[PDB]
């Protein structure tokens, strides 16, 4: 189906102690593949996936050069916003940026995006047309006018339609053995008595990729997902994901309940019940 290349920047000021802490992380779909952390004597862009290790020194030097320059602009940006908002230097502040491209199965662009924050709130965002900006407050309006004058939207449009899509295709081919093959969930129903009268039935989905999944419960062939407790999809730690959904049932009535699992890896959606 659809695929994405995405980057996430975070900068956190450190009052009275030196330069801001800057973190950059890159993702292809749900898989992280690059990192940068400013907290090192000589920090570099680094691999976080086996399939990107192949890239030569040229690649790593260019990414490192770009990320280090970005870290410096984020440092000046934090200082600039202290002036815009008339805020004390003594208090810590933070700025985030996330951007990326979503493509169709054949490789063609579906959408490009870019957004900036300040202290956990929307600051400025590139519009859908990739030609204009939406500013969230009067400080962001200063930035907006500045970026309009500089022709910033054109550079983003060039990157998102060009470099972003092209390199995503390269990444997908480089790691086709992992990125392009869906990993089906291992599924089971477990039983946990609460008392002689009540019992918890928990439906497990383990070790799946990608993260998107649907867990639903039925009773007597009727939907009762509204009664279930569903945990947020969580990382297993090895690049796969986990999720469960549980219902409290009357003891003796467990055969009336069915858990249904839908995931991209499954040729057929599975329905399970307590054995």
């Amino acid at each position: 189906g659809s695929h994405s290349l995405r980057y996430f920047y975070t900068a956190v000021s450190r009052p009275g102690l030196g330069e801001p802490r800057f973190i950059a992380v890159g993702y292809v779909d749900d898989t992280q593949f690059v990192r940068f952390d400013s907290d090192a004597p000589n920090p570099r862009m680094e691999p976080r996936a086996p399939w990107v290790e192949q890239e030569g020194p040229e690649y790593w030097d260019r990414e490192t050069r770009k990320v280090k320059n970005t870290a410096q602009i984020f440092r000046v940006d934090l200082n600039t916003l202290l002036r815009y908002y008339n805020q004390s230097e003594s208090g810590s502040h933070n700025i985030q940026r996330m951007y990326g491209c979503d493509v169709e199965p054949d490789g063609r662009l579906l959408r490009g995006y870019n957004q900036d924050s300040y202290d956990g709130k929307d600051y400025i965002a590139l519009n859908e047309d990739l030609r204009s900006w939406t500013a969230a407050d009067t400080a962001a309006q200063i930035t907006g006018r500045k970026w309009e004058e500089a022709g910033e939207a054109e550079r983003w449009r060039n990157y998102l339609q060009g470099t972003c899509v092209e390199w995503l295709a390269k990444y997908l081919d480089m790691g086709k053995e992992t990125l392009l093959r869906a990993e089906s969930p291992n599924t089971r129903v477990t039983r946990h008595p609460i008392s002689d009268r009540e019992v918890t039935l928990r439906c497990w989905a383990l070790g799946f990729y990608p993260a998107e999944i649907t867990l639903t419960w039925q009773r007597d062939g009727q939907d009762h997902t509204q009664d279930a407790e569903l945990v947020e999809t969580r990382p297993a730690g090895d690049g796969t994901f986990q999720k469960w959904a549980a219902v409290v049932v009357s003891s003796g009535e467990e055969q009336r309940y069915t858990c249904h699992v839908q995931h991209e890896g499954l040729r057929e959606p599975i329905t399970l019940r307590w054995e």
Binding site: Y7, A24, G26, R62, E63, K66, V67, N69, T70, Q72, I73, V76, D77, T80, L81, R97, Y99, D116, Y123, I124, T143, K146, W147, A150, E152, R155, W156, Y159, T163, C164, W167
Partner: peptide, 9 residues
């Protein structure tokens, strides 16, 4: 590949 360094806010 990332985008190149942005213009200041």
């Amino acid at each position: 590949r990332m985008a190149n360094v942005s213009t200041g806010r």
